[PDB]
Amino acid sequence: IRQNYSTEVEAAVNRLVNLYLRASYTYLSLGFYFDRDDVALEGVCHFFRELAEEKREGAERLLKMQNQRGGRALFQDLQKPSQDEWGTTPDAMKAAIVLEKSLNQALLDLHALGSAQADPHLCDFLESHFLDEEVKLIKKMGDHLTNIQRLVGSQAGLGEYLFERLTLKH
Amino acid sequence: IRQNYSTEVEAAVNRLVNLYLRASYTYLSLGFYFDRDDVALEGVCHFFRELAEEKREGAERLLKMQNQRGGRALFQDLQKPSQDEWGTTPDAMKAAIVLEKSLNQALLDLHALGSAQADPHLCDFLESHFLDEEVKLIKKMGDHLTNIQRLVGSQAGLGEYLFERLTLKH
Amino acid sequence: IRQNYSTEVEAAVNRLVNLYLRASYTYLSLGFYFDRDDVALEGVCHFFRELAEEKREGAERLLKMQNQRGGRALFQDLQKPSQDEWGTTPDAMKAAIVLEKSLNQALLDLHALGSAQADPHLCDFLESHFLDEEVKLIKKMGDHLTNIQRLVGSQAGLGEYLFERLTLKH
Amino acid sequence: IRQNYSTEVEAAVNRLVNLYLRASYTYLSLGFYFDRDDVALEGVCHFFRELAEEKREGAERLLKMQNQRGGRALFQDLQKPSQDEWGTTPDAMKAAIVLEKSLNQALLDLHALGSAQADPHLCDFLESHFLDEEVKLIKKMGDHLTNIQRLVGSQAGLGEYLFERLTLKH
Amino acid sequence: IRQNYSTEVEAAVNRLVNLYLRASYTYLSLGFYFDRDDVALEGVCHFFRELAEEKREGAERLLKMQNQRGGRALFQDLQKPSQDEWGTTPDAMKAAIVLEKSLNQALLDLHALGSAQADPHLCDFLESHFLDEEVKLIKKMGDHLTNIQRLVGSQAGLGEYLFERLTLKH
Amino acid sequence: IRQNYSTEVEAAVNRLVNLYLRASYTYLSLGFYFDRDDVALEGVCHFFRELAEEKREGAERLLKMQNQRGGRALFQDLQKPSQDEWGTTPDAMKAAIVLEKSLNQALLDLHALGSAQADPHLCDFLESHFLDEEVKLIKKMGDHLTNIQRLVGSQAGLGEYLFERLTLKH
Amino acid sequence: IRQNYSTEVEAAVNRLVNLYLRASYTYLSLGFYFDRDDVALEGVCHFFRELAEEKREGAERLLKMQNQRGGRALFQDLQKPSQDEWGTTPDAMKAAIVLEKSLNQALLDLHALGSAQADPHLCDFLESHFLDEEVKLIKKMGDHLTNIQRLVGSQAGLGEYLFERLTLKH
């Protein structure tokens, strides 16, 4: 069935799967960090546990597409998250933005590769399911970071609690 | 009907009933302290009045089991709570954690006794209705304490109000 | 907020709380005695477990009123019930009547104190929530005692069973 | 599939199946004895026919677990019940308690064996589905026996009828 | 909040999280292998994708418990699955059984550790959420393997199709 | 109440109860054999577990009739099933037919006895609840055996699976 | 239309109609005896008035069958019941059993006649609508008699009342 599907794109898709699964693992670690009894911000834990699910769904979508095109999924080891402890809510949100911008750059790099290989199905796939989702998420995180930094500028403890209660918790 | 039910476990079960009823009485005192017009934290009062009910239900469960096994319930005087006034919300939550950890230790001690006497019904009973309930409650209280301490670090009065309104009250 | 609320009434209200909680504890012991496998009268157990709840509710009502008036709740040790074993159904009902008449006398004594201190809120509170409830309960217990004594006059075992099945159980 | 499942536990489980099926057969005989036109206590017949079903369900649960663990069910002859006629209601209830205590002892013996063989699945299985069920049933039978003996102390015929009508029949 | 929670159990729980997440990753690879256009067994893909979810849920449950006890989650790299291609349906089912038996052994090892450290909450937790789930799953896989081997003994291609259509697909 | 009910029929009815209970036990063994992880034919297990229930119901009906007529139920030991392992699906179905034909012959023998003793209630009872049920069941089993033998003539493993999936399973 | 219908069976059917109508009249007398203000057992009156209806329905069924076969109904005088007063509840139940056994014997005699005349429609008719109904009713009456005799052994007046209230009345 394989048609117009380069080995370069096939390999890049496998690398992107690894990146999405790595991101999901990072968000799992963020979520459980905020579930610690000495951290205890349920809204923040929920926000990150939801993102862990969204990243896993992205990997799954890439894998389904890989098979649709007749490429072969190849899994690699998943690196552990970059930190064991994630600091304050603004620290964590900054780390999440860095992470999402790195995924976004990988998406843009793959889109450029597909464009060079004249693979319009790949380009459409990324546009339909990834590019706008990423931009929306990065905007949301940037808005959150602005709100948290505004809050913790005034008084740190009070600010983090108010943000978790009035923006994140549902 | 009595079978495989030691006098040691029977007596220890009666002591545990006293401990649970003592805890219930302590939570009654905490609840009404937060109902004072010069304290006036309704969410906190409700949290403790609910725990007074949960402790009483635990005593009742122990008593029902005592009869099921053919042991004999023996009631003792109930000591009054350790304080008449309970201070600030963090003071009260710390006292509650100390209390719950003491009940938990008594549960673990009884489990060890049942294990030594080869009383698997007793061990199962504690596992099914007490051990996890206690761990969950202690986790919840620890989370609350972290949130209150974070809040009152910034500004004490404001912090206590915000916690009562946005975490406890329903 | 305190207005027209004497220290004498405040202290007497605290003593009445202790009496109601003591009564609740007595009814808990009666209820579990009738739950023993060698006693086994479920209707009787239920009757007393329900009264344990009603007495606790009375204490709670007194405590709420104490705070409403700006008095301060002070808890004391709770004495254990007067017996460990409660005999036959008529023995138990007689003990319950003695108990309820002692609470009633304490209510009448407090009403007289409130009347002497010209505290009409206290008098109304006792009238609305306590005086008639007590009279109704004492009447019910007296009716039960007459029925049980009539039954156990004929044949003791048969009588106790019939009373539990046809009057108490639901 | 077999893992951590000793030959000792496998054989003991087969013996316990035989014991439960023997008990079921005993309750079948009790039920039909009370269905005799010259005995004629429908409530008593129903109570025992229901227990015959519960014992069979216990055997079935043991057999399902045997296969789950990769053990092999081995059936043996089922001994007939110890009596052909079961006497009065108190005679029958006493025989039922003796029977249930013998099953309970077999459960405790198997639990001890599983504990010695470090077989926590077996221990959990007995705790979840057998230990508390047995204790509850023995308590119920003990309560019934107390009620019947209280009734037949007064007048035998009248007592047995009243018990069947007002406790057992539904 | 930490009470009766050893550093040995804390570390072993972290290792078990890694094992469950590794298993989930293995099942993800199995699922997508059966989704290849040159393999194309949808029922088999679904069976393994469902198990990938169940393993992830197990890891999540362990992490929640770790925090409940006041332990600290520590994540490690996740090894890639042992194969890139999984052969025939019987090959894949055999590999799944080997995997599940390895998880089961790790559960039994942790239970033994908890038992030695006198940690009854840990033991109950494993019994309630892991031990029986594993035994049930291993039984199901063993049943599947017997059916597939019976089918592919007769005629390989026909057998694999029939199994996927009539046992797995829904 | 006994009228026109011979001692010969009474004894023969007791023997028939034993035969039906023996048959029920045989079907229990067949059912669990097909539940073994190395046999694993759920449809076959269900078919036999359902027949175990039907045989038990037949015994129960005989016992109820015994009491209705004023006869006395007398239980004997129940012999274990003739095999521990039941072979292939056709082996098992053949054994079931042999069993049912033996019950049928016992029914015909009892009918002949009732006819000789001029016991028309007995004859009607067997006609209403046993004779046609047996003929229908034997026909069903004969149809199943023809289908299984037709299937395993072609290819044994494939045949047994197809029969279990497309005839028996629901 | 008459076919295979002997004059002997025709006459015997007419005699059986007379017997059923006589029985109905007897039950009418029993019912109204228990309705006397100086007897006053409503449950007993209802039981017998219901049987008067059942006997009349039996006569009606015989008459319909007589016409179906082309026989000719011939009515005779109906003898009054054997007593004007029926004594105690056990006296009445004994008389009812004697009555029902006499009807049953007449049914058995007619069945034997039909069998000798090779009249299978007659035999089937008696089996379908009479033989089992009679056996069930006799069993019920025997059970009632056992219960009443057990009750009046203890204390006569109390026993009769309890039986009427707790077994018969609805």
Side-chain angles (χ1 to χ4, degrees), chain B residues 1 18 21 25 28-29 32-33 35-38 49 56 60 63-64 67-68 70-81 84, chain C residues 1 18 21 25 28-29 32-33 35-38 49 56 60 63-64 67-68 70-81 84:
Chain B
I1 69 169
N18 191 268
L21 295 172
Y25 199 17
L28 184 73
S29 172
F32 278 98
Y33 168 77
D35 181 56
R36 286 171 49 161
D37 76 276
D38 62 358
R49 295 195 59 198
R56 194 188 55 253
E60 280 163 9
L63 291 162
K64 172 178 226 205
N67 277 341
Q68 287 177 327
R72 292 292 171 252
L74 284 180
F75 297 96
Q76 304 301 158
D77 304 326
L78 298 175
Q79 289 165 224
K80 77 172 181 178
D84 299 323
Chain C
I1 69 169
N18 191 268
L21 295 172
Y25 199 17
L28 184 73
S29 172
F32 278 98
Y33 168 77
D35 181 56
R36 286 171 49 161
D37 76 276
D38 62 358
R49 295 195 59 198
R56 194 188 55 253
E60 280 163 9
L63 291 162
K64 172 178 226 205
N67 277 341
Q68 287 177 327
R72 292 292 171 252
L74 284 180
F75 297 96
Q76 304 301 158
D77 304 326
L78 298 175
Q79 289 165 224
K80 77 172 181 178
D84 299 323

Coordinates of all heavy atoms in Angstrom, one line a residue, chain B residues 1 18 21 25 28-29 32-33 35-38 49 56 60 63-64 67-68 70-81 84, chain C residues 1 18 21 25 28-29 32-33 35-38 49 56 60 63-64 67-68 70-81 84:
Chain B
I1 N -21.2 -19.3 69.8 CA -20.7 -18.9 68.4 C -19.3 -18.6 68.4 O -18.7 -18.6 67.3 CB -21.6 -17.8 67.7 CG1 -21.4 -16.4 68.4 CG2 -23.1 -18.2 67.6 CD1 -21.9 -15.3 67.6
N18 N -13.2 2.8 72.6 CA -13.0 3.9 73.4 C -12.2 5.0 72.7 O -12.6 6.2 72.7 CB -12.4 3.5 74.7 CG -12.4 4.7 75.7 OD1 -11.4 5.4 75.8 ND2 -13.5 4.7 76.6
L21 N -14.5 6.7 70.0 CA -15.5 7.5 70.6 C -14.8 8.8 71.2 O -15.4 9.9 71.1 CB -16.3 6.8 71.7 CG -17.2 5.7 71.2 CD1 -17.8 4.9 72.3 CD2 -18.3 6.2 70.3
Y25 N -15.6 12.7 70.1 CA -15.9 13.8 71.1 C -14.9 15.0 70.8 O -15.4 16.1 70.9 CB -15.7 13.2 72.5 CG -16.3 13.9 73.6 CD1 -17.3 14.9 73.5 CD2 -15.9 13.6 74.9 CE1 -17.8 15.6 74.6 CE2 -16.4 14.3 76.0 CZ -17.4 15.2 75.9 OH -17.9 15.9 76.9
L28 N -16.3 16.8 67.9 CA -17.4 17.6 68.3 C -17.0 19.0 68.9 O -17.5 20.0 68.6 CB -18.3 16.8 69.3 CG -19.6 17.5 69.8 CD1 -20.6 17.4 68.6 CD2 -20.1 16.7 71.0
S29 N -16.0 18.9 69.7 CA -15.4 20.1 70.4 C -14.8 21.0 69.3 O -15.0 22.2 69.4 CB -14.4 19.8 71.5 OG -13.8 20.9 72.0
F32 N -17.6 22.8 67.3 CA -18.4 23.9 68.0 C -17.5 25.1 68.3 O -18.0 26.2 68.5 CB -19.2 23.4 69.2 CG -20.5 22.8 68.7 CD1 -20.6 21.4 68.6 CD2 -21.5 23.6 68.4 CE1 -21.8 20.9 68.1 CE2 -22.7 23.1 67.9 CZ -22.9 21.8 67.7
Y33 N -16.2 24.9 68.4 CA -15.2 25.9 68.6 C -15.3 26.9 67.4 O -15.3 28.1 67.5 CB -13.8 25.4 68.8 CG -12.7 26.5 68.8 CD1 -12.5 27.3 69.8 CD2 -11.9 26.6 67.6 CE1 -11.5 28.3 69.8 CE2 -10.9 27.6 67.5 CZ -10.7 28.4 68.6 OH -9.7 29.4 68.6
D35 N -17.7 27.3 65.4 CA -19.0 27.9 65.4 C -19.2 29.1 66.3 O -20.2 29.7 66.3 CB -20.0 26.8 65.7 CG -21.5 27.2 65.7 OD1 -21.9 27.8 64.6 OD2 -22.2 27.1 66.6
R36 N -18.2 29.3 67.2 CA -18.2 30.5 68.1 C -18.3 31.8 67.2 O -17.7 31.9 66.2 CB -16.9 30.6 68.9 CG -16.8 29.6 70.0 CD -15.5 29.5 70.7 NE -15.0 30.8 71.1 CZ -14.0 31.0 72.0 NH1 -13.5 30.0 72.7 NH2 -13.6 32.2 72.3
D37 N -19.1 32.8 67.7 CA -19.2 34.0 67.0 C -17.9 34.8 66.8 O -17.8 35.5 65.8 CB -20.3 34.9 67.6 CG -19.8 35.6 68.9 OD1 -19.8 35.1 70.0 OD2 -19.3 36.8 68.8
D38 N -16.9 34.5 67.7 CA -15.6 35.2 67.6 C -14.6 34.3 66.9 O -13.4 34.6 66.9 CB -15.1 35.6 69.0 CG -15.0 34.4 69.9 OD1 -15.2 33.3 69.7 OD2 -14.5 34.7 71.1
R49 N -17.4 18.5 62.2 CA -18.6 17.8 62.6 C -18.9 16.6 61.8 O -19.3 15.6 62.3 CB -19.9 18.8 62.6 CG -19.8 19.9 63.7 CD -21.1 20.6 64.0 NE -22.1 19.7 64.5 CZ -23.4 20.0 64.5 NH1 -23.8 21.2 64.1 NH2 -24.3 19.1 64.9
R56 N -17.7 8.1 65.1 CA -18.8 7.4 65.8 C -19.2 6.2 64.9 O -19.4 5.1 65.5 CB -20.0 8.4 66.0 CG -21.0 7.8 67.0 CD -22.2 8.6 67.1 NE -22.9 8.9 65.8 CZ -22.8 10.0 65.1 NH1 -22.2 11.1 65.6 NH2 -23.4 10.1 63.9
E60 N -19.1 2.2 66.0 CA -20.3 1.4 65.8 C -20.0 0.1 65.0 O -20.5 -1.0 65.3 CB -21.4 2.2 65.2 CG -22.1 3.1 66.2 CD -22.9 4.2 65.7 OE1 -23.1 4.3 64.5 OE2 -23.4 5.0 66.6
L63 N -18.2 -2.3 67.3 CA -19.1 -2.9 68.3 C -19.9 -4.0 67.6 O -20.1 -5.0 68.2 CB -20.0 -1.8 68.9 CG -19.3 -0.9 69.9 CD1 -20.1 0.3 70.1 CD2 -19.0 -1.7 71.2
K64 N -20.4 -3.8 66.3 CA -21.1 -4.7 65.6 C -20.3 -6.0 65.4 O -20.7 -7.1 65.6 CB -21.6 -4.2 64.3 CG -22.3 -5.2 63.4 CD -22.8 -4.6 62.1 CE -24.2 -5.1 61.8 NZ -24.5 -5.0 60.3
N67 N -19.8 -8.1 68.6 CA -21.0 -9.1 68.8 C -21.0 -10.2 67.8 O -21.3 -11.3 68.1 CB -22.3 -8.3 68.8 CG -22.6 -7.7 70.1 OD1 -22.1 -8.1 71.2 ND2 -23.6 -6.7 70.1
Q68 N -20.7 -9.9 66.5 CA -20.6 -10.9 65.5 C -19.7 -12.1 65.8 O -20.0 -13.2 65.6 CB -20.2 -10.4 64.1 CG -21.2 -9.6 63.4 CD -20.8 -9.0 62.1 OE1 -19.6 -8.6 62.0 NE2 -21.7 -8.8 61.2
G70 N -18.9 -12.9 68.9 CA -19.2 -13.4 70.3 C -18.4 -12.9 71.4 O -18.4 -13.4 72.5
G71 N -17.8 -11.8 71.2 CA -17.1 -11.0 72.2 C -18.1 -10.1 72.9 O -19.3 -10.1 72.6
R72 N -17.7 -9.5 74.0 CA -18.6 -8.7 74.8 C -18.1 -7.3 74.9 O -17.0 -7.0 75.4 CB -18.8 -9.4 76.2 CG -19.6 -10.7 76.1 CD -21.0 -10.6 75.6 NE -21.6 -11.9 75.3 CZ -21.9 -12.3 74.1 NH1 -21.7 -11.5 73.0 NH2 -22.5 -13.5 73.9
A73 N -19.0 -6.4 74.5 CA -18.7 -5.0 74.5 C -18.6 -4.5 76.0 O -19.5 -4.8 76.8 CB -19.7 -4.2 73.8
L74 N -17.5 -3.8 76.3 CA -17.4 -3.2 77.6 C -17.0 -1.8 77.5 O -16.0 -1.5 76.8 CB -16.3 -4.0 78.5 CG -16.7 -5.4 79.1 CD1 -15.5 -5.9 79.8 CD2 -17.9 -5.3 80.0
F75 N -17.9 -0.9 77.9 CA -17.6 0.6 77.8 C -16.9 1.1 79.0 O -17.1 0.7 80.1 CB -19.0 1.3 77.5 CG -19.6 0.8 76.2 CD1 -20.6 -0.2 76.2 CD2 -19.2 1.4 75.0 CE1 -21.2 -0.6 75.0 CE2 -19.8 1.0 73.8 CZ -20.8 0.0 73.8
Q76 N -16.1 2.1 78.7 CA -15.4 2.8 79.7 C -15.7 4.3 79.7 O -16.2 4.8 78.6 CB -13.8 2.6 79.6 CG -13.4 1.1 79.7 CD -13.8 0.4 81.0 OE1 -13.9 -0.9 80.9 NE2 -14.0 1.1 82.1
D77 N -15.3 5.1 80.7 CA -15.5 6.5 80.7 C -14.8 7.1 79.4 O -13.8 6.5 78.9 CB -14.8 7.2 81.9 CG -15.4 6.7 83.2 OD1 -16.6 6.3 83.3 OD2 -14.6 6.6 84.3
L78 N -15.3 8.1 78.8 CA -14.7 8.8 77.7 C -14.1 10.1 78.2 O -14.7 11.0 78.7 CB -15.8 9.2 76.6 CG -16.5 8.0 76.0 CD1 -17.6 8.5 75.0 CD2 -15.5 7.1 75.2
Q79 N -12.8 10.2 78.0 CA -12.0 11.4 78.4 C -12.4 12.6 77.5 O -12.7 12.4 76.3 CB -10.5 11.2 78.1 CG -9.8 10.3 79.0 CD -8.5 9.9 78.3 OE1 -8.1 8.7 78.3 NE2 -7.8 10.9 77.8
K80 N -12.5 13.7 78.2 CA -12.8 15.0 77.4 C -11.6 15.3 76.5 O -10.5 14.8 76.6 CB -13.0 16.1 78.4 CG -11.8 16.6 79.1 CD -12.1 17.9 79.9 CE -10.8 18.5 80.5 NZ -11.1 19.7 81.2
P81 N -11.9 16.1 75.5 CA -10.8 16.5 74.5 C -9.7 17.2 75.2 O -9.9 17.8 76.2 CB -11.6 17.4 73.5 CG -13.0 17.0 73.6 CD -13.2 16.6 75.1
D84 N -9.8 23.0 75.3 CA -11.1 23.7 75.3 C -11.2 24.7 74.1 O -12.3 25.0 73.7 CB -11.3 24.5 76.6 CG -11.3 23.6 77.8 OD1 -11.9 22.5 77.7 OD2 -10.9 23.9 78.9
Chain C
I1 N -21.8 39.8 71.2 CA -23.2 39.5 71.0 C -24.0 39.1 72.2 O -25.2 39.2 72.2 CB -23.4 38.4 69.9 CG1 -22.9 37.0 70.4 CG2 -22.8 38.8 68.5 CD1 -23.4 35.9 69.5
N18 N -23.5 17.6 79.0 CA -22.9 16.4 79.5 C -23.9 15.3 79.8 O -23.7 14.1 79.5 CB -22.1 16.7 80.7 CG -21.2 15.6 81.2 OD1 -21.6 14.8 82.0 ND2 -20.0 15.5 80.6
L21 N -25.2 13.8 76.5 CA -24.2 12.9 75.9 C -24.0 11.6 76.7 O -23.9 10.5 76.2 CB -22.9 13.6 75.7 CG -22.9 14.8 74.7 CD1 -21.6 15.5 74.8 CD2 -23.2 14.3 73.3
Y25 N -24.7 7.8 75.4 CA -23.7 6.7 75.6 C -24.5 5.5 76.3 O -24.2 4.3 75.9 CB -22.6 7.2 76.5 CG -21.3 6.4 76.5 CD1 -21.0 5.5 75.5 CD2 -20.4 6.7 77.5 CE1 -19.8 4.8 75.5 CE2 -19.2 6.0 77.5 CZ -18.9 5.1 76.6 OH -17.7 4.4 76.6
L28 N -26.4 3.7 73.6 CA -25.5 2.9 72.8 C -25.2 1.5 73.4 O -25.3 0.5 72.8 CB -24.2 3.7 72.6 CG -23.2 3.0 71.6 CD1 -23.7 3.1 70.2 CD2 -21.9 3.8 71.8
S29 N -25.0 1.6 74.8 CA -24.7 0.3 75.5 C -25.9 -0.6 75.5 O -25.8 -1.8 75.3 CB -24.2 0.6 76.9 OG -24.1 -0.6 77.7
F32 N -26.4 -2.3 72.0 CA -25.5 -3.4 71.7 C -25.6 -4.6 72.6 O -25.3 -5.7 72.2 CB -24.0 -2.9 71.5 CG -23.8 -2.2 70.2 CD1 -23.8 -0.9 70.0 CD2 -23.6 -3.1 69.1 CE1 -23.6 -0.3 68.7 CE2 -23.4 -2.5 67.8 CZ -23.4 -1.1 67.6
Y33 N -26.2 -4.3 73.7 CA -26.5 -5.5 74.7 C -27.5 -6.3 74.0 O -27.4 -7.6 74.0 CB -26.9 -4.9 76.0 CG -27.5 -6.0 76.9 CD1 -26.7 -6.9 77.6 CD2 -28.9 -6.2 77.0 CE1 -27.2 -7.9 78.4 CE2 -29.5 -7.1 77.9 CZ -28.6 -8.0 78.5 OH -29.2 -9.0 79.4
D35 N -28.1 -6.7 70.9 CA -27.5 -7.2 69.7 C -26.6 -8.4 70.0 O -26.1 -9.1 69.0 CB -26.7 -6.1 69.0 CG -26.0 -6.6 67.7 OD1 -26.7 -7.1 66.8 OD2 -24.8 -6.4 67.5
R36 N -26.4 -8.8 71.3 CA -25.6 -10.0 71.7 C -26.3 -11.2 71.2 O -27.5 -11.3 71.2 CB -25.5 -10.1 73.2 CG -24.5 -9.1 73.8 CD -24.5 -9.1 75.3 NE -24.4 -10.4 75.9 CZ -24.1 -10.6 77.2 NH1 -23.8 -9.6 78.0 NH2 -24.1 -11.9 77.7
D37 N -25.5 -12.2 70.7 CA -26.1 -13.4 70.1 C -26.9 -14.2 71.2 O -27.8 -14.9 70.8 CB -25.0 -14.3 69.5 CG -24.2 -15.1 70.5 OD1 -23.2 -14.5 71.1 OD2 -24.5 -16.2 70.9
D38 N -26.6 -14.0 72.5 CA -27.3 -14.7 73.6 C -28.4 -13.8 74.2 O -29.0 -14.1 75.2 CB -26.3 -15.1 74.6 CG -25.5 -14.0 75.3 OD1 -25.6 -12.8 75.0 OD2 -24.7 -14.3 76.2
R49 N -30.9 2.2 69.9 CA -29.9 2.9 69.0 C -30.5 4.2 68.4 O -29.8 5.2 68.3 CB -29.3 2.0 67.9 CG -28.5 0.8 68.5 CD -27.6 0.1 67.5 NE -26.6 1.0 66.8 CZ -26.0 0.7 65.7 NH1 -26.2 -0.4 65.1 NH2 -25.2 1.6 65.1
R56 N -28.0 12.5 71.3 CA -26.9 13.2 70.7 C -27.4 14.5 70.0 O -26.8 15.5 70.1 CB -26.2 12.3 69.7 CG -24.8 12.8 69.3 CD -24.1 12.0 68.2 NE -25.0 11.8 67.1 CZ -25.6 10.7 66.8 NH1 -25.4 9.6 67.5 NH2 -26.3 10.6 65.7
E60 N -26.4 18.4 70.7 CA -26.0 19.2 69.6 C -26.8 20.5 69.5 O -26.3 21.6 69.2 CB -26.1 18.5 68.2 CG -24.8 17.6 68.1 CD -24.9 16.5 67.1 OE1 -25.9 16.4 66.3 OE2 -24.0 15.6 67.1
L63 N -25.7 22.8 72.2 CA -24.4 23.4 71.9 C -24.6 24.6 70.9 O -24.0 25.6 71.0 CB -23.4 22.4 71.4 CG -22.9 21.4 72.5 CD1 -22.3 20.2 71.8 CD2 -21.9 22.1 73.4
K64 N -25.5 24.4 69.9 CA -25.7 25.4 68.9 C -26.3 26.6 69.6 O -25.9 27.8 69.3 CB -26.7 24.8 67.8 CG -27.1 25.9 66.9 CD -28.0 25.3 65.8 CE -27.6 25.9 64.4 NZ -28.7 25.9 63.4
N67 N -23.6 28.7 71.6 CA -22.9 29.6 70.7 C -23.8 30.8 70.2 O -23.4 31.9 70.2 CB -22.3 28.9 69.5 CG -21.0 28.2 69.8 OD1 -20.3 28.6 70.8 ND2 -20.6 27.3 69.0
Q68 N -25.1 30.5 69.9 CA -26.0 31.6 69.5 C -26.1 32.7 70.5 O -26.2 33.8 70.1 CB -27.4 31.0 69.2 CG -27.5 30.3 67.9 CD -28.9 29.7 67.7 OE1 -29.6 29.4 68.6 NE2 -29.3 29.6 66.4
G70 N -23.7 33.4 72.7 CA -22.4 33.9 73.0 C -21.8 33.3 74.3 O -20.8 33.8 74.8
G71 N -22.4 32.2 74.7 CA -21.8 31.4 75.8 C -20.7 30.5 75.2 O -20.4 30.5 74.0
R72 N -19.9 29.9 76.1 CA -18.8 29.1 75.7 C -19.0 27.7 76.1 O -19.1 27.3 77.3 CB -17.5 29.7 76.2 CG -17.2 31.1 75.5 CD -16.9 31.0 74.0 NE -16.9 32.3 73.3 CZ -17.8 32.7 72.5 NH1 -18.8 31.9 72.2 NH2 -17.7 33.9 71.9
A73 N -19.0 26.8 75.1 CA -19.1 25.3 75.4 C -17.8 24.8 76.1 O -16.7 25.1 75.7 CB -19.3 24.6 74.1
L74 N -18.1 24.1 77.2 CA -17.0 23.5 77.9 C -17.4 22.0 78.1 O -18.4 21.7 78.7 CB -16.8 24.2 79.3 CG -16.0 25.6 79.3 CD1 -15.9 26.1 80.7 CD2 -14.7 25.4 78.6
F75 N -16.5 21.1 77.6 CA -16.8 19.7 77.6 C -16.1 19.1 78.8 O -15.0 19.5 79.2 CB -16.4 19.0 76.3 CG -17.2 19.5 75.1 CD1 -16.7 20.5 74.3 CD2 -18.5 19.0 74.9 CE1 -17.5 21.0 73.2 CE2 -19.2 19.4 73.8 CZ -18.7 20.4 73.0
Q76 N -16.8 18.1 79.4 CA -16.2 17.3 80.5 C -16.2 15.8 80.2 O -16.8 15.4 79.2 CB -17.0 17.5 81.8 CG -17.2 19.0 82.2 CD -15.9 19.7 82.5 OE1 -15.8 21.0 82.5 NE2 -14.8 19.0 82.9
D77 N -15.4 15.1 81.0 CA -15.4 13.6 80.8 C -16.9 13.1 80.8 O -17.8 13.6 81.4 CB -14.7 12.9 81.9 CG -13.2 13.4 82.1 OD1 -12.5 13.7 81.1 OD2 -12.7 13.4 83.2
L78 N -17.1 12.1 80.0 CA -18.4 11.4 79.9 C -18.3 10.1 80.7 O -17.6 9.1 80.3 CB -18.9 11.1 78.5 CG -19.1 12.3 77.6 CD1 -19.4 11.8 76.2 CD2 -20.2 13.2 78.1
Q79 N -19.1 10.0 81.8 CA -19.2 8.8 82.6 C -19.7 7.6 81.8 O -20.7 7.8 81.0 CB -20.1 8.9 83.7 CG -19.7 9.8 84.9 CD -20.9 10.2 85.7 OE1 -21.1 11.3 86.1 NE2 -21.7 9.2 86.0
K80 N -19.2 6.4 82.0 CA -19.7 5.2 81.3 C -21.1 4.9 81.9 O -21.5 5.3 82.9 CB -18.7 4.1 81.6 CG -18.8 3.5 83.0 CD -18.0 2.2 83.1 CE -18.0 1.6 84.5 NZ -17.2 0.4 84.5
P81 N -21.9 4.1 81.1 CA -23.2 3.8 81.6 C -23.2 3.0 82.9 O -22.2 2.4 83.2 CB -23.8 2.9 80.4 CG -23.0 3.3 79.2 CD -21.6 3.7 79.8
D84 N -23.2 -2.8 82.7 CA -22.5 -3.5 81.5 C -23.5 -4.4 80.8 O -23.4 -4.7 79.6 CB -21.3 -4.3 81.9 CG -20.2 -3.4 82.5 OD1 -20.1 -2.3 82.0 OD2 -19.5 -3.8 83.4

